[PDB]
Amino acid sequence: AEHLIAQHSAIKMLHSRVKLILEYVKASEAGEVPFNHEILREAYALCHCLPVLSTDKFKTDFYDQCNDVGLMAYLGTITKTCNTMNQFVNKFNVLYDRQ
Amino acid sequence: VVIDPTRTISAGKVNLGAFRTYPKGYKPPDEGPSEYQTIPLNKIEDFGVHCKQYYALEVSYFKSSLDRKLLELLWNKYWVNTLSSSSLLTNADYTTGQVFDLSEKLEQSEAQLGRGSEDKLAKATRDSCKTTIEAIHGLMSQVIKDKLFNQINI
Amino acid sequence: FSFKKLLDQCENQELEAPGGIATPPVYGQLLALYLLHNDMNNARYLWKRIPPAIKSANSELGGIWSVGQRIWQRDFPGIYTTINAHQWSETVQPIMEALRDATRRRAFALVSQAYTSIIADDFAAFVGLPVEEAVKGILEQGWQADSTTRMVLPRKPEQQLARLTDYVAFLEN
Amino acid sequence: RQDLSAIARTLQEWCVGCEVVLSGIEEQVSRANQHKEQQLGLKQQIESEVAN
Amino acid sequence: LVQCILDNTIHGRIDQVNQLLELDHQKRGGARYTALDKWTNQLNSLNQAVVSKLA
Amino acid sequence: SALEQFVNSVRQLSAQGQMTQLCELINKSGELLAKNLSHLDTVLGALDVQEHSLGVLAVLFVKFSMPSVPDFETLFSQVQLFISTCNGEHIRYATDTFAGLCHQLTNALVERKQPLRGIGILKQAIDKMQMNTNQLTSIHADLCQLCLLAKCFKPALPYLDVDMMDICKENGAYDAKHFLCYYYYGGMIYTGLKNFERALYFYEQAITTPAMAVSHIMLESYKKYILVSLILLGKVQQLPKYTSQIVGRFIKPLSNAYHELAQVYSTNNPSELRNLVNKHSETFTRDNNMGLVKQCLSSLYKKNIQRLTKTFLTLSLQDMASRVQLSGPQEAEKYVLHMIEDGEIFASINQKDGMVSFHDNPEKYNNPAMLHNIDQEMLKCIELDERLKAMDQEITVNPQF
Amino acid sequence: LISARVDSHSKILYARDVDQRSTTFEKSLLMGKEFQRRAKAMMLRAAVLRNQIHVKSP
């Protein structure tokens, strides 16, 4: 909850900028608001910058990152379950067994 | 004042403490909650020996009216840096160092169960939890970036 | 797609309708459908479950198992020969053609992975189609065909955030 | 001038994208609390059975 | 080159078929995988020792 | 006279408090019961046929004769009508006569001929005896036995695939041989479907059982354990230290041929294993596991071809035929093709030059496939931890020792 | 100590280099699988020791 709040605010800021630029585009195209060759040209240049990194090398690296964290998470969950198993057997050897 | 710059980065939260010592011979009173931190095995002995010889102060921060204004105006552009953090590889060697320690801790917790300090496995489990939780948060930021900038198309 | 639904329906009819012993056309469908999914462990134990009375009265069932023997031995040319030998319209014939197509896809996918270079006659026998038809199809697909030696050189071919939140919720509690 | 709409067609496609991501967080954060409190509550029940 | 690689003065290997020296360079983040390797080994022995308790 | 009273005493406990008196009523029943029970079953389905019908049908199967003249089919249908839509609620207290009824139905169908439909009915009874995550009831063995005789393992899997916790007793209703039979027959079911992993697991769990005397179920499960471990793994898997002493003292030297088979398997010689299979062939056919030892021979050949990947990269078919002992490059090509198809080796065939090219690189661990694999495996570990949390909580609620 | 593969067609001995990542992933995944089987086994062991299920001597 406290770790993704700075990202949520950053994304909200980005979303505002994206919405303001989009509204400028529609205002220009619909009419009334003054047409500009240069600004809409840069908005076109901004549209062509999406998606950022679609190469196969980046896909291999992104999924390498994701599998590394995934494997690490699996080993961490194994450690926690090893501890939970240890608690259970420690108590089972006292109640259901005489050591 | 003591600061851990490495854990600041990995946890995404400032890791700072302010401390004052007790005079030689003087004993602290009853109440001492002690907020838990993972201490590596090469430091834990010394930590335990001296942990009751001092106390922690309640830390808070402040800024000026101009700092307030300037930081809001800085944010109007500094948001870009939050969506381009790349925290998983900036200080990678830390998490790999912690895992090494965690492994040796687990070796000691296995030796505790062997035949026959207060439950080393639970401590090691909380350490592995913390390290993993930090790693998954890193992946969360990476996936967020992938969702925002890569999955758009023409 | 729809064959799996008919398999489940036949698997229900296997136990709901009898009296001990089930209906012979359902047995034929169940056997041929057990051959379709390549589950030979289910098919072999189904054929041995059949009483000798239906085995003598319905020889067409034995004609369906004669294909299964070849599938068990993995003799492809024999599989394509045994498929085109018996006729049992509406009941077994419409799924035998699906078996033939599935065996063709299975053999093509096997040769594309298991072989670098294979003799054109061997490949034709593996897919069941004649040599000219097979070589035409692979040249159209993109495999490297060589004449004189008669060799064919094959060419080998929230959603994420919710899971992570559940993992941290597990570790943190 | 005529094909200008296409630019907006991608800009909106990004906007909606953001609007998903944002909501996603809002939900996930909520879930992260929804678990925590629940677990605390459950612990407080276990700890209440120690007296018996 | 044989004598030199055997005495560890040159870091690399010889490709005798193509007649070249393939020098040692390929280094990545191999420190993590070794830590994860020892973590795996210790978790194996630990889970065996935890299951050993009950009977 | 007396049989006309008991029915009225069943309705008295209906929709009321305790039914322990009803358990005492089924415990006594009537001793020398008459045919009139059938007539009493004509007007008995007032609420939901009740637990009275269980006592009536249990006594009908306790008869040791008939059980309902050559018209037993009617009785069978009655039993069906008692299990299907009748079910019950207080079966948990009447488990003894319920499991007893299922055991007697199973034994009657085994003594008769084809027990196909018996499976289909039994799975309902099991479904109403167990709680939620399933309990190891005795009927679970019977089901398996039935599907082992009536060769149809397909519908018995959902009750075998679950690693169920806590054995359901309640008023006795359980014997060690039912546990042993469930794991042995279940092991044979997984062996017949060529799922050697769960098969080996099941035989292992059948051997681990604490025992003072040696049973034939344990012997046969041990023999089949060695066979499946020779098929699945390159050698015999070590049984746990908590296994019974009688296994290493009595079962081990009794099944001497199987350890002899593993001893000849370790030398990696197929002709010598063939000689040993021909030597004790009568003993292997006596145990009725001849076929699995043939799979052991084929797995030895496959092990010998799998040993070539560790040392060779590009090997001739004639060289392979000479090393693995197959006679001719044709059989080598057959074996390699089968092994690629079954996913046992990672190799390719070159017919022009007559060569086999070993690759040995299934994955680099960057697929989402691994992401999904790790997600599923992690979910399994999370499930296991939550089960352990539940067990630990359950123990914390209980009194101290 | 030789960590190589023999290419008997061309009569060339190629040195084998172990992939670090794949080996670490492989042994970790297999460890998780062995851990799960040990967990199922001890689950059933807990169940038989709880219900006192054992083979009687007579």
PDB file of C-alpha atoms in Angstrom, chain A residues 7-93:
ATOM      1  CA  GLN A   7       4.034   5.322  -8.669  1.00  0.00           C
ATOM      2  CA  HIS A   8       0.235   5.930  -8.503  1.00  0.00           C
ATOM      3  CA  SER A   9       0.859   9.705  -8.195  1.00  0.00           C
ATOM      4  CA  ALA A  10       3.484   9.618 -10.989  1.00  0.00           C
ATOM      5  CA  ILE A  11       1.085   7.717 -13.270  1.00  0.00           C
ATOM      6  CA  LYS A  12      -1.709  10.183 -12.355  1.00  0.00           C
ATOM      7  CA  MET A  13       0.578  13.072 -13.369  1.00  0.00           C
ATOM      8  CA  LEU A  14       1.433  11.312 -16.678  1.00  0.00           C
ATOM      9  CA  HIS A  15      -2.265  10.587 -17.293  1.00  0.00           C
ATOM     10  CA  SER A  16      -3.004  14.312 -16.791  1.00  0.00           C
ATOM     11  CA  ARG A  17      -0.307  15.365 -19.288  1.00  0.00           C
ATOM     12  CA  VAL A  18      -1.533  12.724 -21.765  1.00  0.00           C
ATOM     13  CA  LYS A  19      -5.150  13.926 -21.333  1.00  0.00           C
ATOM     14  CA  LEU A  20      -4.202  17.634 -21.762  1.00  0.00           C
ATOM     15  CA  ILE A  21      -2.254  16.892 -24.990  1.00  0.00           C
ATOM     16  CA  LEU A  22      -5.128  14.684 -26.277  1.00  0.00           C
ATOM     17  CA  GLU A  23      -7.633  17.467 -25.588  1.00  0.00           C
ATOM     18  CA  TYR A  24      -5.403  19.957 -27.427  1.00  0.00           C
ATOM     19  CA  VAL A  25      -5.340  17.560 -30.423  1.00  0.00           C
ATOM     20  CA  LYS A  26      -9.158  17.223 -30.490  1.00  0.00           C
ATOM     21  CA  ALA A  27      -9.647  20.997 -30.004  1.00  0.00           C
ATOM     22  CA  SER A  28      -7.355  21.672 -32.990  1.00  0.00           C
ATOM     23  CA  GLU A  29      -9.007  19.017 -35.208  1.00  0.00           C
ATOM     24  CA  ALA A  30     -12.612  19.958 -34.281  1.00  0.00           C
ATOM     25  CA  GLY A  31     -11.842  23.654 -34.951  1.00  0.00           C
ATOM     26  CA  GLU A  32     -12.264  26.974 -33.052  1.00  0.00           C
ATOM     27  CA  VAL A  33      -8.899  26.552 -31.219  1.00  0.00           C
ATOM     28  CA  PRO A  34      -5.958  27.791 -33.405  1.00  0.00           C
ATOM     29  CA  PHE A  35      -4.327  25.168 -35.669  1.00  0.00           C
ATOM     30  CA  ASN A  36      -0.588  24.634 -35.273  1.00  0.00           C
ATOM     31  CA  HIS A  37       1.635  22.690 -37.600  1.00  0.00           C
ATOM     32  CA  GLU A  38       4.496  22.451 -35.110  1.00  0.00           C
ATOM     33  CA  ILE A  39       2.751  21.287 -31.903  1.00  0.00           C
ATOM     34  CA  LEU A  40       0.515  18.594 -33.478  1.00  0.00           C
ATOM     35  CA  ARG A  41       3.617  17.507 -35.428  1.00  0.00           C
ATOM     36  CA  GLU A  42       5.373  16.878 -32.093  1.00  0.00           C
ATOM     37  CA  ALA A  43       2.243  15.071 -30.822  1.00  0.00           C
ATOM     38  CA  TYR A  44       2.531  12.884 -33.947  1.00  0.00           C
ATOM     39  CA  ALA A  45       6.237  12.360 -33.110  1.00  0.00           C
ATOM     40  CA  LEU A  46       5.181  11.443 -29.534  1.00  0.00           C
ATOM     41  CA  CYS A  47       2.572   8.950 -30.809  1.00  0.00           C
ATOM     42  CA  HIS A  48       5.261   7.240 -32.928  1.00  0.00           C
ATOM     43  CA  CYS A  49       7.489   6.765 -29.842  1.00  0.00           C
ATOM     44  CA  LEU A  50       4.984   4.161 -28.466  1.00  0.00           C
ATOM     45  CA  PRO A  51       5.594   1.228 -27.685  1.00  0.00           C
ATOM     46  CA  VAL A  52       8.979   1.823 -26.106  1.00  0.00           C
ATOM     47  CA  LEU A  53      11.267  -1.224 -26.720  1.00  0.00           C
ATOM     48  CA  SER A  54       9.446  -4.021 -28.629  1.00  0.00           C
ATOM     49  CA  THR A  55      12.665  -5.882 -29.621  1.00  0.00           C
ATOM     50  CA  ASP A  56      13.192  -9.626 -28.940  1.00  0.00           C
ATOM     51  CA  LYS A  57      16.355  -8.932 -26.880  1.00  0.00           C
ATOM     52  CA  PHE A  58      14.312  -6.776 -24.507  1.00  0.00           C
ATOM     53  CA  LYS A  59      11.590  -9.470 -24.291  1.00  0.00           C
ATOM     54  CA  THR A  60      14.232 -12.081 -23.392  1.00  0.00           C
ATOM     55  CA  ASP A  61      15.699  -9.704 -20.756  1.00  0.00           C
ATOM     56  CA  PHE A  62      12.299  -8.705 -19.290  1.00  0.00           C
ATOM     57  CA  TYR A  63      11.240 -12.342 -18.952  1.00  0.00           C
ATOM     58  CA  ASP A  64      14.757 -13.125 -17.549  1.00  0.00           C
ATOM     59  CA  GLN A  65      14.117 -10.511 -14.804  1.00  0.00           C
ATOM     60  CA  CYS A  66      10.624 -11.902 -14.195  1.00  0.00           C
ATOM     61  CA  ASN A  67      11.824 -15.525 -13.968  1.00  0.00           C
ATOM     62  CA  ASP A  68      14.663 -14.526 -11.602  1.00  0.00           C
ATOM     63  CA  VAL A  69      12.266 -12.753  -9.199  1.00  0.00           C
ATOM     64  CA  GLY A  70       9.815 -15.643  -9.742  1.00  0.00           C
ATOM     65  CA  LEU A  71      12.373 -18.308  -8.762  1.00  0.00           C
ATOM     66  CA  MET A  72      13.469 -16.174  -5.806  1.00  0.00           C
ATOM     67  CA  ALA A  73       9.844 -15.845  -4.675  1.00  0.00           C
ATOM     68  CA  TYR A  74       9.422 -19.637  -4.984  1.00  0.00           C
ATOM     69  CA  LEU A  75      12.516 -20.265  -2.794  1.00  0.00           C
ATOM     70  CA  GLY A  76      11.282 -17.646  -0.250  1.00  0.00           C
ATOM     71  CA  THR A  77       7.826 -19.269  -0.052  1.00  0.00           C
ATOM     72  CA  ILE A  78       9.583 -22.650   0.356  1.00  0.00           C
ATOM     73  CA  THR A  79      11.543 -21.224   3.333  1.00  0.00           C
ATOM     74  CA  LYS A  80       8.339 -19.892   4.959  1.00  0.00           C
ATOM     75  CA  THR A  81       6.524 -23.225   4.407  1.00  0.00           C
ATOM     76  CA  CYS A  82       9.581 -25.047   5.845  1.00  0.00           C
ATOM     77  CA  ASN A  83       9.149 -22.893   8.988  1.00  0.00           C
ATOM     78  CA  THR A  84       5.364 -23.521   9.168  1.00  0.00           C
ATOM     79  CA  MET A  85       6.054 -27.273   8.799  1.00  0.00           C
ATOM     80  CA  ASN A  86       8.595 -27.035  11.642  1.00  0.00           C
ATOM     81  CA  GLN A  87       6.050 -25.316  13.957  1.00  0.00           C
ATOM     82  CA  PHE A  88       3.357 -27.923  13.204  1.00  0.00           C
ATOM     83  CA  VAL A  89       5.658 -30.950  13.792  1.00  0.00           C
ATOM     84  CA  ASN A  90       7.034 -29.357  17.005  1.00  0.00           C
ATOM     85  CA  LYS A  91       3.454 -29.112  18.373  1.00  0.00           C
ATOM     86  CA  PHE A  92       2.271 -32.484  16.953  1.00  0.00           C
ATOM     87  CA  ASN A  93       5.156 -34.265  18.771  1.00  0.00           C
TER      88      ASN A  93
END
